[PDB]
Design a protein around this ligand. Structure first.
Ligand SMILES: *CCC(=O)N1CCN2Cc3cc(C#C)c(-c4c(O)cccc4Cl)c(F)c3OC[C@H]2C1
Ligand SMILES: Nc1nc2c(ncn2[C@@H]2O[C@H](COP(=O)(O)OP(=O)(O)O)[C@@H](O)[C@H]2O)c(=O)[nH]1
Ligand SMILES: [Mg+2]
Length: 170
């Protein structure tokens, strides 16, 4: 029957859990060693607020920043997940650079994004919840705490981005 296809892109520094968040959503698996240069897309059909949704998720990786292939996925991308790790201060600081780069390639100021603080299962936190929420408010986007290990917030992160895209359409 009726459904909506959503083109999603996951971006963030090395080792934050981009690949782990994608594989956890798609096949309920926590991957320990996913090759950091492997940049693949994964499809998943899910019901979100009683609407059938076809998620198409690009997991960015260690490849050239400005190849025709990445430009194509960035230009077609409808929503962005801005991922940092809550035990990695530099990955959180880097969120500023990624948001502006997304705005620049999308040539717009209203691009649907969600801020995702991943590895929420780790005690050795260095980015407190308040700091992340401050950053999220400064950009007018929601913030979701997630763990690819425990599955906490994984569904919520992707489903919230879908809701953000819905708002942007109307
Ligand atoms: C460990 C390797 C890995 O997972 N990577 C490599 C580093 N990369 C950083 C990154 C940088 C930029 C930039 C500039 C973008 C990007 C590009 O290339 C074009 C348009 C918009 C944006 Cl945000 C990017 F997507 C990434 O992805 C994260 C990360 C992945
Ligand atoms: N404890 C914990 N480890 C994680 C989590 N997400 C990813 N990792 C680990 O961090 C490492 C880097 O993950 P990966 O998904 O490859 O990061 P990427 O470079 O952003 O794609 C891997 O060993 C993962 O098992 C998480 O939520 N909790
Ligand atoms: Mg990866």
């Amino acid at each position: 029957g009726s459904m909506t296809e959503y083109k999603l892109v996951v971006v963030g520094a090395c080792g934050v859990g981009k690949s782990a968040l994608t594989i956890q959503l798609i096949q309920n698996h926590f991957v320990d060693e996913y090759d950091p240069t492997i940049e693949d897309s994964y499809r998943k059909q899910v019901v979100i607020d009683g609407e059938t949704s076809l998620l198409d998720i690009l997991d960015t990786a260690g490849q050239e920043e400005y190849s025709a292939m990445r430009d194509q996925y960035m230009r077609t991308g409808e929503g962005f997940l801005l991922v940092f790790a809550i035990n990695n201060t530099k990955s959180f600081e880097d969120i500023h650079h990624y948001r502006e780069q997304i705005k620049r390639v999308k040539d717009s100021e209203d691009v649907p994004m969600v801020l995702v603080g991943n590895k929420s299962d780790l005690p050795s936190r260095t980015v407190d919840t308040k700091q992340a929420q401050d950053l999220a408010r400064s950009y007018g986007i929601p913030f979701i705490e997630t763990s690819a290990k425990t599955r906490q917030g994984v569904d919520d992160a992707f489903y919230t981005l879908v809701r953000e895209i819905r708002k942007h359409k109307e």
